[PDB]
Amino acid sequence: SLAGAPKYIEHFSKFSPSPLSMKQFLDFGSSNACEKTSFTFLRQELPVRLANIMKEINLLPDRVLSTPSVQLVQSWYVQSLLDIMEFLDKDPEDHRTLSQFTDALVTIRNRHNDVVPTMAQGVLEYKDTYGDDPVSNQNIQYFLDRFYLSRISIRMLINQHTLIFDPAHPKHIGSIDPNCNVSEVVKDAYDMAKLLCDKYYMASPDLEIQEINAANSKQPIHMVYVPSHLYHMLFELFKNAMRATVESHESSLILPPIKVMVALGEEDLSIKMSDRGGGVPLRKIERLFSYMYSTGYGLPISRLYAKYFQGDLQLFSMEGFGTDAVIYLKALSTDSVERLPVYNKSAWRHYQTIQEAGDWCVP
Amino acid sequence: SLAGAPKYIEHFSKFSPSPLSMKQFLDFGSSNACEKTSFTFLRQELPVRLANIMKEINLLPDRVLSTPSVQLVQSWYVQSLLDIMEFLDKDPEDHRTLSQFTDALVTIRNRHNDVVPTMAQGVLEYKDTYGDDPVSNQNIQYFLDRFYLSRISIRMLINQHTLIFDPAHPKHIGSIDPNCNVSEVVKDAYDMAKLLCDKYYMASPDLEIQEINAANSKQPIHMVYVPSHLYHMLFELFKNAMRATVESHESSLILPPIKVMVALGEEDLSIKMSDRGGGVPLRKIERLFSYMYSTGYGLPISRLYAKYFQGDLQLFSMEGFGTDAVIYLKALSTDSVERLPVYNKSAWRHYQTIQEAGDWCVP
Numbered sequence A, B: 001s002l003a004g005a006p007k008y009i010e011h012f013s014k015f016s017p018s019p020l021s022m023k024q025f026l027d028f029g030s031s032n033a034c035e036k037t038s039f040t041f042l043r044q045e046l047p048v049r050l051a052n053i054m055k056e057i058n059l060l061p062d063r064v065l066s067t068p069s070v071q072l073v074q075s076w077y078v079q080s081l082l083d084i085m086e087f088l089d090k091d092p093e094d095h096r097t098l099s100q101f102t103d104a105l106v107t108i109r110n111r112h113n114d115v116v117p118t119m120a121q122g123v124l125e126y127k128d129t130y131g132d133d134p135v136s137n138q139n140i141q142y143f144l145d146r147f148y149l150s151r152i153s154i155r156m157l158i159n160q161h162t163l164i165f166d167p168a169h170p171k172h173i174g175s176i177d178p179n180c181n182v183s184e185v186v187k188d189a190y191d192m193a194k195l196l197c198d199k200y201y202m203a204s205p206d207l208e209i210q211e212i213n214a215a216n217s218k219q220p221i222h223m224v225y226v227p228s229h230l231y232h233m234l235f236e237l238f239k240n241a242m243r244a245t246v247e248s249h250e251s252s253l254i255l256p257p258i259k260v261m262v263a264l265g266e267e268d269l270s271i272k273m274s275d276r277g278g279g280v281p282l283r284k285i286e287r288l289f290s291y292m293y294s295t296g297y298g299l300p301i302s303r304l305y306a307k308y309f310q311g312d313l314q315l316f317s318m319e320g321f322g323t324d325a326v327i328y329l330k331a332l333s334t335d336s337v338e339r340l341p342v343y344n345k346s347a348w349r350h351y352q353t354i355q356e357a358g359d360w361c362v363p
């Protein structure tokens, strides 16, 4: 039988999460020896990651914390932590321990399947119940970036363990493709977005891809990456680019194509998606990444996927012309290291915000 | 005879600077009635702007404040404030007051001519004397953006007064062109940068300009702006784009052109400069706007000019291919309002930084 959850949360929140690189993930084996190691690692690391973020949930404004949906998500995290605590005294040598552990991780993954839209309902509840205010809004924005990135990282750990120690492509290591053909993923995302655009508008822009392999001009561009994450980002970007193009060309039968450039440099693998969808004023760019205005978290969650392995996703528009979106990825698996929020004094001080006049003038 | 400077600094730092819009600047007349109004406005507003920024100088780390060059600049600001204090009890009705005031502003402008490189020497002195540290560096970056923007605004006020109440183009209102042809300024900046590039490399990329006037496809794009500021930004951008293009093409006789798009939307006038100079990894972009790494303040000062009337200057590269730089300006004179730093509690808290582990994980 287990201690009360707060005792575990306090214990594990003292540790910092331990970021892994893509190479470390990829170089992990599938033997029983490896499964025991994964077990002993995860029964420490998953509680550390769960506890760290649960401590930050507590820093949210009372208004947001008081909402039923935020309380519900909190309750899922508590149960998931306790599920893992059941394994603290279990023997990795016992095969039943390992199989039970995998079952528990699957149960946790399912429990948390709807976390993103449930948190979004919490934001809506806060808005509806109290009205929004600038201070709470900035805290929510800061928190949600970290909460959703934390969640991405926990899902990564769980998927790697369950996929490796249970198909489509046996060459993958869990969810990682050591030879991801970037243009192929671009095409897959385009194809799916085209189906949607065609359904609603009966037309869609064509795709043009150009590759720039700086060091090896001949060679098709590949990388070590999780194709599902790359697909996610590109699909969201294509949906926006397609909608802009069609909606800004209502009187036209000829649609400008969406142009994608994939560039491979010494350190970056960059993917630029350029549309001629008429663009958006600079003032309105920030809103596209806001959880508050978006309550529709496609763009901010996509940018988190990019940031997760030390990349980024940036938007640059020319109002009256169109928009460029750029996904920046690390070219090398050794540079592709998890970006994980950590609960400490610096994190804590960020929530300690209050209402005041800013450091810049008003007329 | 005058009070000690600190008594004036305390008095005037209580007020907030008053931001003017481009339209307000432009709608100001040249009559004796207007000169008296400009006088009575500036003998309050200039002391307010001087005092506000002098109070922030005092928040710099002792290490930076202790440098001879920072002390020298401080001493200039003190004398300039006192110069204006001489006018507090003077009669605007007396023509000698007005003429003496204009002389005093000219003297102040000359006194402060070398502020930018003198402050940069202060940064170098801090580096040489103590070695740099991350906390001081972040404070310097925050301060210098505000200090240099404050300086831009003070020079704007002084130039407007001296130019209007003392040529090349009588249609200008002080330094403001109500009908600035943007492509003409682009060409002027290109021409000057080409002279420099040709001198050192014996070759330079060609220029291609495209305009997108969204609402009036025929019409050449014009705006209300200070052409010297726009020229400054474009010249710096062309120098970087040209150098990148030539240096990345050492073995080539054919240079890719620099492409400029000028787009006019409902709210933004955007100028994009695109080069194929091989680009720079994302990791190194931030450094381009850093005063510390730049000690060469061309890019950060250019971005301040853009920000001064509520615009921005952004860089986006594709490593292995090239770089896009975008100047965002407000299309409408009514939206073009001075962006002025103000000394208050929010400003004060920014300098109150200390050394600690960040809110994100290390391996």
Ligand SMILES: O=S(=O)(c1ccc(O)cc1O)N1Cc2ccccc2C1
Pocket (backbone or CB within 6 Å): A236, A237, A238, A240, A241, A243, A244, A245, A247, A248, A275, A277, A278, A279, A280, A288, A315, A317, A322, A323, A325
């Ligand atoms: O704001 S956007 O410029 C835009 C945003 C994100 C993106 O990835 C691509 C884009 O092009 N764009 C989205 C959209 C939708 C309907 C009608 C007009 C527009 C304009």
Ligand SMILES: O=S(=O)(c1ccc(O)cc1O)N1Cc2ccccc2C1
Pocket (backbone or CB within 6 Å): B236, B237, B238, B240, B241, B243, B244, B245, B247, B248, B275, B277, B278, B279, B280, B288, B315, B317, B322, B323, B325
């Ligand atoms: O970093 S840049 O990508 C670059 C920076 C700013 C800019 O306006 C345009 C640019 O293109 N670029 C500057 C430079 C100089 C010499 C050799 C190679 C490079 C690359």
